[PDB]
Design an enzyme around this catalytic site. Structure first.
Site, short mmCIF file in Angstrom:
data_model
loop_
_atom_site.label_atom_id
_atom_site.label_comp_id
_atom_site.label_asym_id
_atom_site.label_seq_id
_atom_site.Cartn_x
_atom_site.Cartn_y
_atom_site.Cartn_z
N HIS A 16 18.62 -32.94 -62.07
CA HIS A 16 19.22 -34.11 -62.69
C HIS A 16 18.02 -35.09 -62.55
CE1 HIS A 16 23.00 -32.58 -60.93
NE2 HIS A 16 23.58 -33.11 -61.98
N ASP A 76 17.75 -36.64 -59.20
CA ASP A 76 17.47 -35.77 -58.06
C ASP A 76 15.94 -35.82 -57.81
OD1 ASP A 76 20.00 -34.75 -58.08
OD2 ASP A 76 19.51 -32.98 -59.30
N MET A 105 16.19 -25.53 -67.67
CA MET A 105 17.27 -26.46 -68.04
C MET A 105 17.07 -27.74 -67.24
SD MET A 105 20.20 -27.68 -66.45
CE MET A 105 21.15 -26.69 -65.30
N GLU A 155 29.46 -28.65 -69.94
CA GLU A 155 30.07 -27.99 -68.76
C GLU A 155 31.49 -28.51 -68.50
OE1 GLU A 155 27.54 -27.95 -65.52
OE2 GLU A 155 28.99 -27.24 -64.01
N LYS A 180 35.17 -28.77 -66.50
CA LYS A 180 35.71 -28.96 -65.16
C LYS A 180 37.08 -29.64 -65.31
CE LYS A 180 34.39 -30.18 -60.45
NZ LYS A 180 33.46 -31.02 -59.66
N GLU A 212 31.34 -22.82 -65.24
CA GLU A 212 30.99 -22.57 -63.81
C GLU A 212 32.07 -21.74 -63.15
OE1 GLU A 212 29.24 -25.63 -61.36
OE2 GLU A 212 30.95 -25.42 -59.97
N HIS A 245 34.88 -23.75 -61.37
CA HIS A 245 35.60 -24.70 -62.23
C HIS A 245 36.78 -24.05 -62.92
CE1 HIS A 245 31.97 -27.65 -62.52
NE2 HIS A 245 32.31 -27.44 -61.27
N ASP A 285 26.72 -21.24 -64.62
CA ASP A 285 26.67 -21.71 -63.24
C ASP A 285 27.49 -20.69 -62.41
OD1 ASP A 285 25.08 -24.02 -63.85
OD2 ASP A 285 26.65 -25.41 -63.39
N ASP A 301 36.54 -28.53 -55.10
CA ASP A 301 35.39 -27.74 -55.57
C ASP A 301 34.51 -27.33 -54.40
OD1 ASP A 301 33.39 -26.43 -57.16
OD2 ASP A 301 32.98 -28.25 -58.25
N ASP A 314 32.10 -24.74 -54.22
CA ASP A 314 30.70 -24.38 -54.49
C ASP A 314 30.12 -23.44 -53.42
OD1 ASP A 314 30.64 -25.99 -56.87
OD2 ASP A 314 29.62 -27.58 -55.87
N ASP A 324 24.74 -22.86 -58.93
CA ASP A 324 25.19 -24.24 -58.73
C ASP A 324 26.20 -24.13 -57.54
OD1 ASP A 324 25.81 -26.81 -58.69
OD2 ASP A 324 26.77 -27.01 -60.58
O1 XLS Z 1 30.72 -30.24 -60.06
C1 XLS Z 1 29.44 -30.79 -60.41
C2 XLS Z 1 28.80 -30.07 -61.57
O2 XLS Z 1 29.04 -28.67 -61.48
C3 XLS Z 1 27.28 -30.36 -61.68
O3 XLS Z 1 26.56 -29.67 -60.64
C4 XLS Z 1 26.68 -29.90 -63.02
O4 XLS Z 1 26.57 -28.47 -63.14
C5 XLS Z 1 25.41 -30.62 -63.42
O5 XLS Z 1 25.52 -32.04 -63.32
MN MN Z 2 27.83 -26.76 -62.30
MN MN Z 3 31.41 -26.97 -58.83
#
Ligand code: XLS
Ligand code: MN
Ligand code: MN
Ligand code: XLS
Ligand code: XLS
Ligand code: XLS
Ligand code: MN
Ligand code: MN
Ligand code: MN
Ligand code: MN
Ligand code: MN
Ligand code: MN
Lengths: 392, 391, 392, 392
Positions: C52, C55, C86, C179, C181, C215, C218, C243, C253, C255, C290
């Protein structure tokens, strides 16, 4: 690879016997003869069979018929060496039970439900069953104002106390196992989780005779951690029986083969039950499968699915054993301090005053420094999955 | 309009939440505690609660700590607000990353106990009656990382000590365990109201322990909050309650009470207020453990505080009207709600008398009974119409 | 096994760099230097790194600072040979984005959101990125009346068309991946599942430059079948990126490392991606992780967890391969008639007229006989799990 | 209030006719005569009735019987003035459809499934129906390896293309509405959400003839925001029909009376459908109730529940209008900037070049000052609710 009677695998007659008539379609399989079920299960390695009164004797059979059926069933057990570790009563199918058995708002239904159970208790005792499972599938509601929960719990207790009184007076030596379920068929069922069922049992007249019969998918319908719940049940010493099956989270009750749902939790569960304190299992009762052969299968599919349950359980056992026996795992457990949780927080004879005087527990404690050390949990977890995968 | 008899309380951390979330920076500046006391006094709250670290910043020296307490007490004094409950932050600091009382690390466990003892003394000093314990870091992300059995032993070990101490010093505190299924841990120990009650029954002085269930926590598992509170009341373990809103199983939203599952918020108020006599079934604080949405400024914060109180009073009013309606009485009669309160057995009847009653089985016409309807939908429809002010 | 650059494993700088500050606590780890992150990733076998804007370059850095950071970054890339496949923009952290970026009710925020993205597209294009991922984490609402969805979808589309335009005109050759969610951080997020995003994408000015970046956790947050949704994305030819992570159903979430959540769905996902049609993979973009190293870990746990993602993918890949090369599995597939779905329903040149004339399709169809044949699905599922378990 | 034919309330014959045989128990009500159903619904205010082929004419009826039933059915409609706005086909009950209709692994079942629908299309056209609802309840799987999703979507498309071809050639003028559902009866159903169903429809040959028929409970079964998905459906212009009912999140499909599940979302849904642009409703089709009278009720509870659906909708409608007409709400909407979302982000004639030239959109933008202002969403929500409670 092969099952032994020492494995204690049991199946409900209603499992392999499920005709696959779901909420949206007609039966895809014909009825299974109790006698035949006994022989095929004996054959696949099961040590025992369980049943609902109405699974063996069609609701409303005369005593002549009823008696005939029991006699035949009895023979089959005889010839095959199968036992009946547990029996249960159907207090959900007949329309009279639409608002519950023990907790129906209708008083007459409540009297009737108890009578139906007393009778099944008699057959159970005659067949040598040690556990009576109570699944209150219709106890609950679709609307909040329709059911006085407090009154309902009083009535649930009233009925259960009578049942223990009777078993005890007749010398049956039965143990009672309350089976929790969050929903289906009622919108919400009373005693929705293993936790609610344990709390409730603690309030009966002879609590020592009562425990729970938790089911894998039931806890997973609420997205709870089944293994952790069993652990709690074990801590309380209330795990009287267990129903194993698979489920894919919060959705209708799937009743898949054990391990075909949350595989990772199926693994931690076998590990918990089998790698008990000092080598020995932490649980000694039946490993009962309460599952349904998928509606898309035929009788071939049915026997396949019965064996898949046994198979899953033995493959997992095998990897749980190897996981624990691995010195590398042993090293990761040490680094994660898992066993350190077994050491009392307090020193021997230490109380509040000695703890308040210990400057190392607060005043001179370096929280920042301890806060930075990692626990190594991802790595321990990865070692477990690799054993599961047969990669280690 | 709220009265002190309504007993509405708020945690310092609710209106004071800066809205720093898992994915973003804080959108509001810090709220001053004295200021919070004055603002809450103003909207009708009768009491305020706090975690040690909400009032005294983690690591304050004694002079500093002492100063804050003195100011706080003065604010209480001037407004006439009480401190019905206090709690301890055993979740924020990195040292608590694997738990306070059940951390795998023995030294953290010892520290966790000292942190709570200290908060008990301040609660005692402020007149608090309840110690809430939210074991938010007790649990795990992986099954092999935590020995649940040992964890419960250690959870028990720590609580017995707390009770010992309170009882020796004459504090008179009651202890309320707060269940939560998850967040921040993948799985938290004592996940539902049921698990916490079952656990409490195993401590050394069980009479001193109960639970502090939260609307949203039970809903995170898709459980019926009202129905779990009814069971808690039956066991007599409802020592406190945290009210808020939630939209089923997802992260903990902490919305204003009634902004999530409105039907269940309605049946809940009915349960708590249309109690046994005519009287409430529950006599404790109506505590709001919520968060003003991140999209709001301080005007939004005070609006949201008032909305909690408003929701409760509006629901209470409709719950009362529901019960007083003759058409509802009629529907309750048709549905046999009250028949459930009559024992199944006649006085002096046991299994021998029940077995002798041919009408309870041999001559029972199940088919006939099974055909009569309970009229539950109709009863439900009258309730909803009371809720909508349609009657 | 060992990862090769051909595996195309990539990680976001924000994954291994997550300091572990969650909703209830402070960070447990110190900040990771981007250059160091490049070196460590290269060392474990990653082929690329993503990030990002915020980041890499702290929000509000002056141009001299930003330029310095970018240059040091480029040198690390150069020295290690890692690529940037990406890039993405942070439109969720800063308080200004509390009601969203492209869809904030506030007009000036919408204008700023677009400029922040244009600036990132430039840096993306200069680093050689081929995909711009768009995660509208703040687009949505906590209350139904606070947001006009129709207006919101209009504004979303308005911003995306401009981005395509600019990219087109500058010859950047980027592909855009939205993406989805369902929730978190907003109570409800717009474009909640892969389905909603695809249907949306189809309405833009140049749909061909737009696909999705789904993802694993998600879709699992809504308790949907990730593999099946990916299969649909592939059918549409809209899987532009992916992802990979782990999740335990509907809850915040998590992850987790790929495969640490729904292991069985992770297995069928690797089978779908690699055992594509004609020997080769069905998907060729990056295999992006991710995820977040658990809060309980230190920097050792962080690299362990980075390696666990790759190990997990390779182990499941190996087992998926063996699954398909098993003559028994093949025999089960034939019995379950999987491949028969691939044969058109209609005969070549047959239309409704001909179909209507075939009495074998209705008039003389024995539904009852077909209805009784089993599909053998359980048995096929058992062989799949036995491969995953390394039991076959 | 009172329902008028202008409200367009419709009900399926299977709704009030559900006998209440659930997954766990026998039917609690006797069968409902279709003619009586017509009369009873006409009496409560419904303007139309709908049905599955098999609801009206028993599966496997000879021509004479079939013909006989229809003729009586038409008289009742005649007599009462009710219409048949929509028709659907049962592709889920008979055992032959256990693996699906259109996407069964078995080719012979797919051909049969199409024949069965063609015949219903004819009856529908003959009765004046405008919409064909398609609910692929058996399309999906319990196990990932048993269903090739890509092939299934090809087969689904192949069947739909033919149906459109037929209708167009016969001049029936039907519109087709695909009904998404996440699971139940299959573990996972294809086209699980409104989103996936819209994306799918866009790939058909005559997409203008296809839309969706979303059901409140189906989206809630995955915990999604029904109102927001319907808003997306309207944005795309694919809301061909709608199924209204109640549900309590992710659990079995409850099919409660509309507004008896998520009350707040039922409120916002009515507001979206009725307080459309230009004062007028944003949706003009049938307000169809696909619900089930609870199993605890008799025929009186059945008519009560039928009427509750209508009362719920009209009470909600009445409060949505009052809400929008309230000046205080108008003031809150303004402070929340709800309407500013409708003004394009770019000034007329501005493109990326002019946006890039605007220093006020980036270089000189004060994100911090904007980030500090609140949107007043809580107050706006509180006002909506007070309107719902009749407190204002
Ligand atoms: O839940 C947060 C998102 O998954 C983020 O990581 C995206 O993939 C990119 O901003
Ligand atoms: Mn993601
Ligand atoms: Mn996530
Ligand atoms: O959901 C069904 C229950 O699991 C049932 O099979 C019992 O265990 C026996 O009544
Ligand atoms: O999820 C957060 C908890 O509800 C917490 O606020 C307790 O109630 C007090 O620590
Ligand atoms: O869940 C069942 C479906 O909702 C069904 O009623 C369809 O709408 C018509 O086939
Ligand atoms: Mn079950
Ligand atoms: Mn069971
Ligand atoms: Mn909470
Ligand atoms: Mn709380
Ligand atoms: Mn439905
Ligand atoms: Mn429907």
């Amino acid at each position: 690879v092969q099952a032994t009677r020492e494995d204690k695998f049991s199946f409900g007659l209603w499992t392999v016997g499920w005709q696959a008539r779901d909420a949206f379609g007609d039966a895809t399989r014909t009825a299974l003869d109790p006698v035949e079920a006994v022989h095929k299960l004996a054959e696949i390695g099961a040590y025992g069979i369980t049943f609902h009164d109405d699974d063996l004797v069609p609701f409303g059979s005369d005593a002549q018929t009823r008696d005939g059926i029991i006699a035949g069933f009895k023979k089959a057990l005889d010839e095959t060496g199968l036992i009946v570790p547990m029996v249960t009563t159907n207090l959900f199918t007949h329309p009279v039970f639409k608002d519950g058995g023990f907790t129906s708002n209708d008083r007459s239904v409540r009297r009737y439900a108890i009578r139906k159970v007393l009778r099944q208790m008699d057959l159970g005792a005659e067949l040598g069953a040690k556990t009576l499972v109570l699944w209150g599938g219709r106890e609950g509601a679709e609307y909040d104002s329709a059911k006085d929960v407090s009154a309902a719990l009083d009535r649930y207790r009233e009925a259960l106390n009578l049942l223990a009184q009777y078993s005890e007076d007749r010398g049956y030596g039965l143990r009672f196992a309350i089976e929790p379920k969050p929903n289906q068929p009622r919108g919400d069922i009373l005693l929705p989780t293993a936790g609610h069922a344990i709390a409730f049992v603690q309030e009966l007249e002879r609590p020592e005779l009562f425990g729970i019969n938790p089911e894998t998918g039931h806890e997973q319908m609420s997205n709870l951690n089944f293994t952790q719940g069993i652990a709690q049940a074990l801590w309380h010493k209330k795990l009287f029986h267990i129903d194993l099956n698979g489920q894919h989270g919060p959705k209708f009750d799937q009743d898949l083969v054990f391990g075909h749902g949350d595989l990772l939790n199926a693994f931690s569960l076998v590990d918990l039950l089998e790698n008990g304190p000092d080598g020995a299992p932490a649980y000694d009762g039946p490993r009962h499968f309460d599952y349904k052969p998928s509606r898309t299968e035929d009788y071939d599919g049915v026997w396949e699915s019965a064996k898949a349950n046994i198979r899953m359980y033995l493959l997992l056992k095998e990897r749980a054993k190897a996981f624990r026996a691995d010195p590398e795992v042993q090293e990761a457990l040490a680094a994660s301090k898992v066993a350190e949780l077994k050491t009392p927080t307090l020193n021997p004879g230490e109380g509040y005053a000695e703890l308040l005087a210990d400057r190392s527990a607060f005043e001179d404690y370096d929280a920042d420094a301890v806060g930075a050390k990692g626990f190594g949990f991802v790595k321990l977890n990865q070692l477990a999955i690799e054993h599961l995968l047969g990669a280690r």
